[PDB]
């Protein structure tokens, strides 16, 4: 009789590498590098992400006519934007500090759209009307949707009643041919009108710049202006990310469904996701070598 | 000493190929199998977790006039990327190195375990193979596999077979 020792072997390659030598086969292995891709971007948290393609985030927040204002999107885990904006800013203008608003909307997932100001009784002396040819919607002249063009010394304030953070955006007219002063309880500024010549862009002969402030419950902000002002009409009340790409309804290039820690798809992502790494093959060995005889 | 695994023995990790006048075939051991699989699964578990990420909005925006910020951001990002790449690659290579040697050591331990009982009733031939001067039926296979080989029982065999 006879006895001999050995280990089970099979007919698979499953190439792996180690300290000693490259390109060695193994009976059983596990890969820590993942490549599944092209899965259509879906509800990360079972909710519809805020999709606003064909228009820029700025125009979205500022009532650009083209996108129809996406009146109803209560829950939006993340925002997916078209890499190339379309009609992203109806009126030529200089909008400042675009790293503190765009970073404020990366978390809020519930908007209580609320008509901040009245446009029925408190503005009888004001001539609420006007249009810009460069902002003529659907072949007809118009101005905007989230705020209105506009003589007495305008003075008004917010009642600050709701116990939530309230946002207010506005701007000032810059006639290319006025002691506007937002005054918060703990924030102040004082802009003035300019009359300097401007080159023509988007068929218009100048610009109109917009600002924006954030105030918490218990605050009260009082406005003022003499020569011009861009009154607000909708406060996008918050409930405190960005993905530049385009694809039918995560990552900018699809969805991943796996539990491995490392990823080869583009690093940038939103929410919990595997850490990215610049490598091609990371396979662990969980068995023994495989060579017949 | 042992180079390639047999194509037979469909299920198992370590085992024996017994041959006797009555029959022949394979047979898979269990104890070392359980130990090895448990340890390897523990290694895999240890490596996989310890990796948790929060709502990390990696993408950042910077104004035309703040290019210093752009440079700083790209610096930190690429530095983290390179550090993690190197760390993970080294860890995976180390684990790959450390698993095969352990498997081989376990095989050697089992070989010495079987050597222990058959101190002179058998005679080593090579390639991890043994045979006995005495002839025994199937039950001696079970006896040796469980380590209950009765050395005196077959010690009396006429070892002067030459």
């Amino acid at each position: 009789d006879t006895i001999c020792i050995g280990y089970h072997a099979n007919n698979s390659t499953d190439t792996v590498d180690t300290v000693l030598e490259k390109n060695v086969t193994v009976t059983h292995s596990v890969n820590l590098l993942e490549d599944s891709h092209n899965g259509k971007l879906c509800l990360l948290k079972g909710i519809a992400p805020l999709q606003l393609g064909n228009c820029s985030v700025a125009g979205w927040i500022l009532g650009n006519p083209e996108c129809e204002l996406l009146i109803s999107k209560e829950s939006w885990s993340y925002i997916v934007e078209t890499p190339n904006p379309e009609n992203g800013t109806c009126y030529p203008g200089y909008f400042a500090d675009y790293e503190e608003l765009r970073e404020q909307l990366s978390s809020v997932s519930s908007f209580e759209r609320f008509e901040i100001f009245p446009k029925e009784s408190s503005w009888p002396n004001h001539t609420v009307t006007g249009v810009s040819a460069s902002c003529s919607h659907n072949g007809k002249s118009s101005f905007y949707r989230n705020l209105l063009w506009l003589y007495p010394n305008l003075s008004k304030s917010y009642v600050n009643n709701k116990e939530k953070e309230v946002l207010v955006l506005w701007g000032v007219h810059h006639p290319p041919n006025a002691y506007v002063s937002v005054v918060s309880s703990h924030y102040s500024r004082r802009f003035t009108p300019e009359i300097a010549k401007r080159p023509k862009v988007r068929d218009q002969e100048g610009r109109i710049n917009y600002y924006w402030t954030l105030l918490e419950p218990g605050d009260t902000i009082i406005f003022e202006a003499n020569g011009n002002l861009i009154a607000p009409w909708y406060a996008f009340a918050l409930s405190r990310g960005i993905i530049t790409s385009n694809a039918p309804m995560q990552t900018p290039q699809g969805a991943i469904n796996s539990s491995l820690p490392f990823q080869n798809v583009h690093p940038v992502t939103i929410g919990e996701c595997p850490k990215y790494v610049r490598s091609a093959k990371l396979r662990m060995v969980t068995g023994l070598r495989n060579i017949p005889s | 000493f042992i180079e390639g695994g047999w194509t037979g023995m469909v299920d198992g990790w370590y085992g024996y190929h017994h041959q006797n006048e009555q029959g022949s075939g394979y047979a898979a051991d269990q104890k070392s199998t359980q130990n090895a699989i448990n340890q390897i699964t523990n290694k895999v578990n240890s490596v996989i977790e310890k990796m948790n990420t929060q709502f990390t909005a990696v993408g950042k925006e910077f104004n035309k006039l703040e290019r210093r910020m752009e440079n700083l951001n790209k610096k930190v990002d690429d530095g983290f990327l390179d550090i993690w790449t190197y760390n993970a690659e080294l860890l995976v290579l180390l684990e790959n190195e450390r698993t095969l040697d352990f498997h081989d050591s376990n095989v050697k331990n089992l070989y010495e375990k079987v050597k222990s009982q058959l101190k002179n009733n058998a005679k080593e031939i090579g390639n991890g193979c043994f045979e006995f001067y005495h002839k025994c039926n199937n039950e001696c296979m079970e006896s040796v596999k469980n380590g209950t080989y009765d050395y005196p029982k077959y010690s009396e065999e006429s070892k002067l077979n030459r």
Partner: antibody
Amino acid sequence: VQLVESGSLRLSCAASGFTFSSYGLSWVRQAPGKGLEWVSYISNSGISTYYADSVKGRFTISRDNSKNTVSLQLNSLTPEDTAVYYCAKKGSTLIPYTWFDVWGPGVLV
Amino acid sequence: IVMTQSPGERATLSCRASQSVSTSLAWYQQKPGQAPKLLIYGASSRATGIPDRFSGSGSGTEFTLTIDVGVYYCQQDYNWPPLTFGGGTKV
């Protein structure tokens, strides 16, 4: 590699041209008008042995190393044993695998 | 364990058993008078020296040859002590 076989009746299979001490020989019988049939086999060392089911005891096998030749005593002749007998060698030293490659002229008993 | 067997003729052949054998199979051909020669050994793995004209495939209680007139043989070497040679084939 060369092999020759010559020959109760004694029968031997002499061979050379290789390492006779590191291989296992064997024997296969052949009927006058049908396929072949295994009869026996021995390991290289000479300690382990087997035999055909219908022959155990009747025929015996022995081997040496100095002469590089084996022989079967082949006792208890009986008319149905009128079969052509051959000689063959394994193809490798590993126990699990087996195949008879080196085939000789055989003997017509 | 037991075995069995089945111009520009297309030469094919099959050998079957009543039990599962993974790889310990081979093939032996012999022309009349001369001793049998080796053929593909292992699970149809091509043998050496022999002309490449001979070939075959199959496994798991089902083996086939793919291709010199005469007889051929299939042999199983899984359960060792009681070896067995298949039947006689024709062409």
